[PDB]
Amino acid sequence: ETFVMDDYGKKSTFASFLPGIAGIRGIPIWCYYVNRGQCVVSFGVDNKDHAIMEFYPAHQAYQNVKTTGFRTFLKKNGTVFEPFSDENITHRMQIHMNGLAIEEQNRSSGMDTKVVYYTLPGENVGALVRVVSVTNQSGEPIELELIDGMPAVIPYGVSMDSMKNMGQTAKAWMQVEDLSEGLPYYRVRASMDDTAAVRRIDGGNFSACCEADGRRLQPIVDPSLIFSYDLSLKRPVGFEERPLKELLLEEQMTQNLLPCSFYGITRTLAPGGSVTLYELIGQVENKQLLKEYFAEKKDAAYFEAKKREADELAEALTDGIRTRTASAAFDAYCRYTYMDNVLRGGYPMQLGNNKIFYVYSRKHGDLERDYNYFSMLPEFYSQGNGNFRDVNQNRRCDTFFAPFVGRKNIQEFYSLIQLDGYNPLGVEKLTYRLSKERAKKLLTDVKEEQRSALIDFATKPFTPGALCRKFGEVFGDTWDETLFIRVIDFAEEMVNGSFGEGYWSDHWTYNLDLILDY
Amino acid sequence: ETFVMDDYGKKSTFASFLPGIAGIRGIPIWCYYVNRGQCVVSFGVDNKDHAIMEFYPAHQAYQNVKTTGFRTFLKKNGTVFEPFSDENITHRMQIHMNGLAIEEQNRSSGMDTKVVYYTLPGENVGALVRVVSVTNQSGEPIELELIDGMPAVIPYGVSMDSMKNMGQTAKAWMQVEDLSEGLPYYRVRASMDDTAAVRRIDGGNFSACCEADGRRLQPIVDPSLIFSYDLSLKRPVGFEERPLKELLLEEQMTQNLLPCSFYGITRTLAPGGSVTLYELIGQVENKQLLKEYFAEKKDAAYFEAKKREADELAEALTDGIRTRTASAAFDAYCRYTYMDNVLRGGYPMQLGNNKIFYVYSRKHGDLERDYNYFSMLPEFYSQGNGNFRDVNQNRRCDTFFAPFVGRKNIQEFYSLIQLDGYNPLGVEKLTYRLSKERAKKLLTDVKEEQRSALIDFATKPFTPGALCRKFGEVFGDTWDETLFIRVIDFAEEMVNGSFGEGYWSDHWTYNLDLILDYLSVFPEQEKEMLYEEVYTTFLSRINVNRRFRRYVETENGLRQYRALNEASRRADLGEKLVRTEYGSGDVLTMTLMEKLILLGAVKFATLDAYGMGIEMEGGKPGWYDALNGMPGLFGSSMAETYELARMLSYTIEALKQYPGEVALIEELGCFLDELNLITRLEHDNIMRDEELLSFWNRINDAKEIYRDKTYQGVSGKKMVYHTEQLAAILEGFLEIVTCGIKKARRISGEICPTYFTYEVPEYEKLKDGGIRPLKFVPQNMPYFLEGPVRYLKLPVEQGEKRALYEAVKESDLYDGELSMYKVNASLADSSFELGRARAFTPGWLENESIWLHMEYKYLLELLRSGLYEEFFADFKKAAIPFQNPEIYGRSIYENSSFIASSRNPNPSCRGRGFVARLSGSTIEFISMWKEMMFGAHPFRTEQEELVFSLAPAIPAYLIPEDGRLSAAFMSKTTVCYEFGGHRDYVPGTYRIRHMVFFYENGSQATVEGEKVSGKLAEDIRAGRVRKMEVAVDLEHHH
Ligand SMILES: OC[C@H]1O[C@@H](O[C@@H]2[C@@H](O)[C@H](O[C@@H]3[C@@H](O)[C@H](O[C@@H]4[C@@H](O)[C@H](O[C@@H]5[C@@H](O)[C@H](O)O[C@H](CO)[C@H]5O)O[C@H](CO)[C@H]4O)O[C@H](CO)[C@H]3O)O[C@H](CO)[C@H]2O)[C@H](O)[C@@H](O)[C@@H]1O
C-alpha cells in the first residue's frame, strides 16, 4: 500500500504533492515536494501570494531545495553534521496515501534521523505538522545539541511578484512579534499597496515547537545567529563557533529582515535513547483565533491521534474501489487513480436532505503546471471551480458509485448549452440564497441581536463553509446543528456559470457518455 | 587611485556596478556585482529581458551568487579544489575606476588564482571580457586540469517574468547550436509570444574562449556532464568521477535544457609556470555580424590593448577635476564623484559644428533600486532619457567645465515650463530630422541605389548612432566621415518632452541655480540673456481641476483627492509646442523675462488660507517623496515660499538694473493687473489678521480664470509694459511674502517650519456639486532639515544665520554619536495617513536617517553664507572620504543614498551606507569643491571690463607639508598655489602677492598684485593659458 524508494537523492528527479484534504471540518492547505533534500519546497494556504514558503517552478525547486527547504543541524561533541545533505549516506523514502516519511541511517556518526510530514486534519486552523526524531545508535553516551527549522518564512501580506521582483525594498515592511510568549507572529507593518484598509493586516504566520511533555520552546528568528557572515545558507558558522545555550541569550533582530524559525534543545543521549520534536506551521486571520486554538495544551498523544485520523480519512475516502487481484500493485494503482479522480472532479456527498454537494474540488496547479494559477477555499466544506471539459469528464461514472446522485449531472451539464450550440468555459462553485419570509419564519428560537445578524447574512448568497463560520462566530461554542441543517434544506439553489475566454468546438460531445452511464 | 579590500567574504555585504562605458564607438553593457564568491551576479545588454545572466534583487544576489555566478574548478592529482569558495583561505579584492580584479592565495594547494573583469571598449559587439590566470607556487611539477565558465546562460528571446514564473515550461523553446565551430549560439527556436514575426529571432548570446596562441576551445553546454545527479550545482561529481579528456568526447544535450558554457584544458605546470584563459560573452543581432567580428584572430596582445584602452577611457573622461591635496583619498573621491555625476547626467560634447550632444546618460537602476526599470541604448553615441529633477540638478555646473555649452541648458529647461506653471516629468533623448530639399541637395556624391535608401532613412527622425549604423550597413567598410558630419550639421533639432505621470510642486525651483551658475562665468551677457526672444512654451496635457471640485467628502472628514479633470485630457502625440492663433499659427516665442514674470505670478496667489505656505494642488508632494499622502490633507510647504521670495527678489533686482520696455501676452497682463489690484486692496487686512479667506478666494478666482482662459489656446496679441509698474507689483508681492514668512516664523517656534497640514471642520455644499470651505485649522508638523537649508539662501544678516545654526545644532536634528544631520525629527506622533514614510522603521530609508543629499546641501549653504570655521569643522567630520572604512562598510570613494543613524533598532547597522551610489549629492559636492577651490565669483564686471581674481578658502588639514596645492580651472588650465603656512586661509586673512601665467606658445607673463583685467582675462576665459603660479604670503616657510 506504500511505495518505498532507496537513495532517492541519486535517482531521477520528479515532482509530487500531498492531496491536501482536511476533511469536512478542516482547513485544507497545499504542499509540493521533490525527491531532493528533505523533500519539501513550498507550501501555504489559499492561492499564491499567501504562501508560507516561497513558490518555485520545478527547475528552481530542484535547484534551491537544499538551501531554502527545511534544515536540520546536529552537533556531536564539537562536530556539526547535517542529515539529508550527502547522497553517499544511505537514506530511504516512503510515500503514503496522505503522508510522507523519510529517514537516514548514518553509520559514521552513529545517529538515525526520521522526519514525518502530514497536514493537520479537522481543525479550525490549517497547518503542516512536522515530526523529527533522532536516535542514538552508538555504544557510548553522547552530548547532542539539535537545531531544526525553516530558514525563510514569508511574512503575511507579501505578494509573490513583490517577493520575486522588489525583494530588497520589500524588507522594510517585514517584522516579527510575540517572541517572549513562544508564538512568533510574522506579518507586515502596514499594507504594501497604496489603497485603503491601512494597518488592517491582522492575519499572520505562526510556528510552535514542543516536546513530548508539551512545553513550548523559545524560537530563533534571526538567521545571522546561525550562519553569521555566510549569506549562502550553506554553513552554520555561528552554530559551530558558539554553543547553543549562548545563542538563546543573545539579542535578535526583529525588523527589516527576512525572518526565520529555528528551535534548539540540549540533551545527553544514552545508548538507545531518542529525542522527538513536534512543530506546527500555519496561517490564521487574527491573533484571537490563534490564542483560542492554543488555549489547551498539545502533546504527543494529540499529534499521533491526528496522524491516525489523517491516514484514516484517505483510507475511508478511497474505500469504494477496493479490490483483490494477483498483484497488489494493481489495486494500489486503482485506489490512487480513484483518489486523483475525486481530487480533480469532486467527491459527491448528501448535504441536508435534498441537496447534492461536491467537496475537495480545486483548480489544480503544481511545480510543472506553473502556468496555472491554483486557488483553494480555506474554510469548512472546501470546494473550487474548474473548466467545463475536465469536470464533465471526471463525473462520467459518478452515478455508479453514488446512486443517490440521480440525474443532477445531466441537468447541470445540459442547462449550460446555449441556443447557438456553444457553452461557457467556466463552471463556478455552488452557492445558496435564502428569501425574506422563509428566513424570518425559520428564525424563531434565537435572541433578537443574533437574529438580526443571521437574517442579514443568510439573505445574501453564501457558501456552506461561510455559513458554518458565521454560525460559530455568532453562537460562540454551544450552538446546535439542527438550525444549520434546516437553513441549508430551506435554502434555494443559485444558478452558476461564467463565460470564460472563448468558444471551443469539442465541449458539447461529452454528454452522451453521461446519458449512457446513467 | 585603487581601493583594496582584504577578505571581502567575511566583511559586510554591499552592491556595486561597473560604469559600463564603451566610448563613442562602442556598445555599452550593464553589469552588477557583490562582494561574495567571484563578484559577478548578473549582466546583459539593453534593458531587462535581454540579460545573459538572470537578474536578481540584492537579497537573492547575495543568496545565489556562489551557485549561479561564475564557477572555477581545479584538479591537482585526483583532488578537486574550488577557488573563491572558502572564506578561510586568504583572498583580496581591487576596485578600479573602470575595472574589477580579484585574487586568492591558497597556501594549502600551492596555487594562485586571479580573475579580471572589464567591458570591451570601442567595438561593434558589446561583450564582457574575462581573464583567468592560475600560477603554480609549489616545489614540484603538477598535473592540472582546469574548468571555468558560467553555469546558466539565458537564451535570447526569454523574458524575465517568463524565466521567474514559467521557467519549467519555458525550457521547451531553448536550444544551442553551432558547437563544432566553437561558437555556441543560444536563442529560442521560435517567438514565445503568440503574435507575428514568427521564426524571426535572429540575435543570440555567444561565448568564445582562447589561450595566448589564439586557438579557440570546444565548449561544454550540458551541465549534467559536470554535476551529474547533483542538481544544486554544489559538487562537480561528474568532473570528479571522470577525466576531462573523456568528457569532451561524450555526446551532449542541445535541446530542452538550460544551457551552460564551460571550457576545459589539460596541462602540466612546472614550478613557477602559469596558465591563462580569455573569454568573451556578449549578444549580437544576427550571425553575420558575429562571423564578421571573428574574421580576424584574437590574441593576448589584443586583450591587453583593450584593457589599457578601457582604463584610459575613464582616466581621460575624469581628467577635468584632477587636484592635489594632503590626502589622496580626497582627490580620488573627487574623481569618483565627477564620474558618477557624468554617468547620471550626461557628458557634454561638441557634435558636428553647431550641435551640443550628451552621451553616457541612462535610466539608472541597480540591485537595490530594484523598483526601477533601467534601459540603455546598445549603439554608438549611447544616450538615455531621465526625469526632470535629476537631469536639471546634475547639469547645474555644466557651463563651468564646458564653456562652449553656453545657454543651451537654460533654454532647454525653461522651454519645458507650461503656461500654468507646471512642467512635464519626462525628458526624452535627443533626435534629429532632415527635410526633403536639403536631403536631396546634400546627397550628390553617391550611387542612386544607396541614395534612395539614405534619403528615405534620413527624412524620418533618427539618433546619431542609428545614422552611423545605417551609414555603415549601406556603404560597407570604405565610407567617409565628412558626409556624416555634413548630414548631422544640416539636420534640424527635434523638440522633446513627455508628460509622464503627474504634477509635482518643486520641479520649477531648480532654474535660478542654472541662471546664477551661467552668470558667474559670463557677467557681461546678462542683458543679452534676459532680452533674448528664443524660448518656447511646452503644450499642457492635463489641466488641474477647480478648487471647488477638488474636494471630496469622506467618512474621516473633508479631503482633497480629486485634482485633475479627465474630461479635458489631451493627446500626447499631436503637438509638443504652443502656437499662436489658438493653435493654427506659427510657434510662439517668449523672452526669458516674460518666463520669469509668468513663473512669479503663477507661483504667487497659490498660498494657503493663512498665507504662509504654498498649496501642493498637483497631487504630488515636494522634494520629500515618502510623504505621498500630504497633498490629500490640504498640505503646504514653506520651502516653496522661500524659493519664491528669492526668485522675486532676483527679478526685482534685474528689473531695476536694466531699464527698458518689456512685452507680455494679454492674459498675463490682465492677471498681473488683477493681482496688483487685489494686493492694493487687501494689504491692510493682511497685516493684522490670523486666518485670511477673502484674499484666498480672490486670488484663487483670478488664477482659475487665467488658467481656464489660457488652456484652450492663446492669441498672439502682445501688450507692451514698462519696468516701473512691474517693479512696484513685484515689490508688493515680495512684501506680502515676507509678511507671511514672518508670521510662519512667529507661529512655528525657534526653528523655521517646513510643512503645514490644515483641516476644515465646517464646509458648505454648493448647488452645482462643488464644496466650499468655511475655515481652516492649521496643524504643526515635525521639523525637517530642508526648511533651514532653503531659508539660508535668503539675504539676511550674519547674526540671524549664526543663531539659526546654533539652534539647529542644539535641536534634535543633530545626531550625537555620528555628529551628522538627520532629515527629520520623530514622526511617530503625527497622523497615520502621511504616506509610506509612516510605515518604515526609524533610522531606515527616508525616516530619521542621514540623507547625504540634504546634509551636503546644508554644508554648501553654510559655506556660501560665510561661516567658514563652522563649515570646516563640520566638513572634517561629515565628509565621505574622511569616514572610517571599517564602520562605513564600503569603499570611501563611493557615495550612498543614506547612512543608518543611532535611531536604528539594530546597533550593528549604525553607521553604514546603503542603496549603492549615484545619489543627488554628487552635484552638491562638485559645487562645494568649485566654491572652495576658486571662490564664489572668479569673474567680475566693472565699466564694461572683465576682472579675474581668486579668493580660495582651504582648511588647514588639506595643505601638504611642502605647501603646494593644485586644481583644474575650467577643466583646461592648471592652477598651482603656494601657501606660506599651516592655517585656515579664509578670505580676509590673506593677501595675494603675485601671479605668473604660462601661455601655450611658451610666452610668459607676470602680473604683480592680485587683480588681472583685460586681454589676459579674456585669454584665461578662452582657455589660452596652460599653467598658473599663485603665491600667497610670498614663499613657504617651515
Ligand atoms: O502545451 C503545454 C501547455 O500549454 C499551455 O498553454 C500555455 C498558456 O496557458 C500560457 O499562457 C500564459 C498565461 O498563463 C500568462 O498569464 C499571465 C499571468 O501569469 C499574470 O499574472 C501573474 C500573477 O499571477 C503573479 O502573481 O504575478 C506575476 C508577476 O506580476 C503575474 O505575471 O497576468 C498576466 C496578465 O493578466 C497573464 O497573462 O500570461 C502569459 C503571457 O501572456 C501566457 O503566455 O502560455 C504558455 C506559453 O505560451 C502556454 O504553454 C496549455 O494551457 C496546456 O494545456 C498545455 O499542456
Ligand SMILES: OC[C@H]1O[C@@H](O[C@@H]2[C@@H](O)[C@H](O[C@@H]3[C@@H](O)[C@H](O[C@@H]4[C@@H](O)[C@H](O[C@@H]5[C@@H](O)[C@H](O)O[C@H](CO)[C@H]5O)O[C@H](CO)[C@H]4O)O[C@H](CO)[C@H]3O)O[C@H](CO)[C@H]2O)[C@H](O)[C@@H](O)[C@@H]1O
Ligand atoms: O522610499 C523608497 C523608494 O520608494 C520608491 O517608491 C516605490 C514605487 O516606485 C514602487 O512602485 C511600484 C512600481 O514600480 C511597480 O511597477 C510595476 C512593474 O514592475 C510591472 O512590470 C514588471 C516588468 O517590468 C517585468 O518585466 O515583469 C514583471 C512581472 O510581470 C512586471 O511586474 O508592471 C506593473 C504594471 O505596469 C507596474 O506597476 O508596480 C508596483 C505595484 O503597483 C508599485 O508598487 O512601489 C514601491 C513600494 O510601494 C515604492 O517603494 C520611490 O520611487 C523612491 O524614490 C524611494 O527611494
